[PDB]
Structures are given as structure tokens and as C-alpha cells.
Amino acid sequence: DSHKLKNFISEIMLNMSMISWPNDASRIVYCRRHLLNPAAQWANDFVQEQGILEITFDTFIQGLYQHFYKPPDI
Amino acid sequence: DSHKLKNFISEIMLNMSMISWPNDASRIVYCRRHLLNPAAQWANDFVQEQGILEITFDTFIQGLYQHFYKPPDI
């Protein structure tokens, strides 16, 4: 799953890369529109645990990167 | 089937949650665009049985929740 989800990080950053942004808030809420079924539950809780309106865009990805935890064998 | 369909309730409410709505009518007709093959037949009949244009958004879900009827054994 996560090996696909590692790639799933890559293009969605690359998609919003070439397009502009008027601010930072709508960028971080754009991701959850594409996210998976149990991950969006974590994604919903993660904004509510943030007391401020936004912790910056990479930090949302790193918690999803910390959601990965997957090494292979060989 | 329905154990998946219980989850299928959850995100589609959560998807439209963070997005706005100008009214209530287009929200209830958005669901049937994703619904299953025999369920959309029930979904088509359910609006026609409503004499008024809309009975509110949860009531459509509860009839789908009443469509479930599935307990497990252990």
C-alpha cells in the first residue's frame, strides 16, 4: 500500500507546484480530497488537534510520511 | 457488502463537509452519482415517493441505513 502511497506524495505536490496559490490554507485542504479511506479519518483529526488554523504544508505530509513506517526485506 | 457500505457513508459526508453548499438540493442528488447498482434504483424511487422536492439530507442516508440490516455472528 505505502509504496504506492510514497508515489502518491510525489505528483500531488508536483501538480500544485506549477499552479499558483493565493494563500496556504486551501493548499493543505486540497490534499484530503484525494486521500484514502482510513487516512482521511486521521487527516480529519490532525487539523482539529492543531489549535492554530494551519501548521505549514510539509508538516501535513510528514505526518502522512510518519504514517508510512514501511521497510522491505531485500 | 454492507460493511463496506457502512464505510461508504462516512467519507462522502466527510467530503462534502469541508466544502460549502449554496443550498440543500444539489447535496442530496450528489450521492446517487456514486451509489451502487440496485441501490440507485431504490434511490430513484425514493425521491419520487417524496411529494415535496426534498426531505433533508440525513433522511436519505437513514433509508440507506435502513437498507443495511446486517448484524454479524461473533
Numbering used by the authors:
A (entry chain A), B (entry chain B): 37 to 110
What does the paper say about this structure?
Here, we have determined the structure and molecular architecture of the Ty3 capsid by 3D and 2D cryo-electron microscopy (cryo-EM) and compared it with those of the retroviruses. In the case of Ty3, Gag3 is cleaved into CA and NC domains. Formation of the capsid is important for genome protection and is an essential step in the retroelement life cycle. Similar to retroviruses, the protruding capsomers of the Ty3 capsid are formed by the CA-NTD, while the inner layer, linking the capsomers together, is formed by the CA-CTD.
Adjacent CA-NTD domains exist in different orientations; therefore, we considered a pair of CA-NTDs [one in orientation A (cyan) and one in orientation B (dark blue)] to be the repeating unit, and aligned and averaged the four independent copies of this pair of CA-NTDs (excluding the CA-NTDs from the fivefold position). In this way, we generated a higher resolution 5.5-Å map of the CA-NTDs. We flexibly fit the homology model of the Ty3 CA-NTD into the new EM map. The N-terminal 36 amino acids of the CA-NTD do not have a defined secondary structure in the homology model; however, in our map, we resolve density corresponding to this region. This density runs outwards along the interface between helix 1 and helix 2 of the CA-NTD in the middle of the threefold (and fivefold) position for ∼60 Å (cyan and blue densities). Interactions between these N-terminal parts of CA-NTDs may contribute to stabilization of the structure at threefold and fivefold positions (central densities). In orientation B, this density continues over the top of the CA-NTD and down the interface of helix 3 of one CA-NTD and helix 1 of the neighboring CA-NTD on the outer side of the threefold position (blue density). The total length of the density in orientation B in the EM map is ∼100 Å and likely accommodates all 36 amino acids. In conformation A, the N-terminal half of the density is not visible; it is not bound to the rest of the CA-NTD and is probably disordered. Instead, the surface of CA-NTD helix 3, where it would otherwise be bound, is occluded by binding the neighboring CA-NTD.
